[PDB]
Each structure stands twice: as structure tokens, then as C-alpha cells.
Design a protein around this ligand. Structure first.
Ligand code: QYY
Length: 110
């Protein structure tokens, strides 16, 4: 059922924000601060920024109708990272590590 799916999505998000994954999850906790970092073209390349704090809000306020909507936002956050950055950048490697955690937990959802 849809409500059961979202309860499991809450657990996945809790796992992505947990201390065990912090070494690679931290660049995704908050929006990219393009202005402070001097990434002048970030909002030109990334039309729909996404981060775990936004996913946390949409989950708390029940803005996701189903698990697929939650998965779309999480994957959009990783896709933005792959889209913007060169493949050798440390953040791209951190995103792949966190995405392996998300994809595993999302696939194992009962
Ligand atoms: C081609 C150029 N790319 C970028 O400099 C770039 C930066 C980022 C960051 C990012 C956001 C912050 S923050 O201060 O905003 C909040 C924490 C701080 C560091 C960040 O990255 C770094 C990381 C993760 C490790 C070492 C060095 C840096 C600059 C996030 N994400 C998701 C990106 O895609 C992205 N790209």
C-alpha cells in the first residue's frame, strides 16, 4: 500500500542522514551554496536543485503521494551532482557511495 511505502521511505531517509554515512552524505544535507562557493553557473545548469533537507521537509509534510515520488527527488539530487561536476571530483564519488546506500535500501523495501 501507498501509506506503508512512505513509512519505509521515512526509514530510508533516516538511514541516509545517519552518522554511519556522514563521510559521504554531508555535501547533500543542505542545498549547494553556489554564491558562497563561487559556482556562478550552478543555477543555470541545475534547474531543479535538490538536497536531503528538502526531501526531509516533503516527507514530514506528506508532499510525496508515493515511494516513486520520493525516489524521483533523491535520484534528482544525485543526477544534479553528476550533471554539474566533472567525474573525477570528490563530490561525485561521495554521491555514488550515498546512492549505493539509497538504491540498496529502496530496492529492499517490503
Ligand atoms: C565543479 C566544481 N564543483 C564544486 O565545487 C561543487 C561543490 C559541491 C558541493 C559542496 C557544497 C558545500 S556547502 O558549503 O554548500 C554545504 C556543505 C561545500 C562543499 C561542497 O563540495 C566540496 C566537497 C563535497 C568536497 C570538497 C570540496 C568541495 C568544494 C556540493 N554538491 C552537492 C555539489 O554538487 C558540489 N559541486
Amino acid at each position: 500500500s501507498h501509506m506503508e511505502q512512505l513509512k519505509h521511505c521515512n526509514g530510508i531517509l533516516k538511514e541516509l542522514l545517519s552518522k554511519k554515512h556522514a563521510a559521504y552524505a554531508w555535501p547533500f544535507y543542505k542545498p549547494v551554496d553556489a554564491s558562497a562557493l563561487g559556482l556562478h553557473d550552478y543555477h543555470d545548469i541545475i534547474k531543479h536543485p535538490m538536497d536531503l533537507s528538502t526531501v526531509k521537509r516533503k516527507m514530514e509534510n506528506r508532499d510525496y503521494r508515493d515511494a516513486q515520488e520520493f525516489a524521483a527527488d533523491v535520484r534528482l539530487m544525485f543526477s544534479n551532482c553528476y550533471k554539474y561536476n566533472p567525474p573525477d571530483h570528490d563530490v561525485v564519488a561521495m554521491a555514488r557511495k550515498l546512492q549505493d546506500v539509497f538504491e540498496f535500501r529502496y530496492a529492499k523495501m517490503p
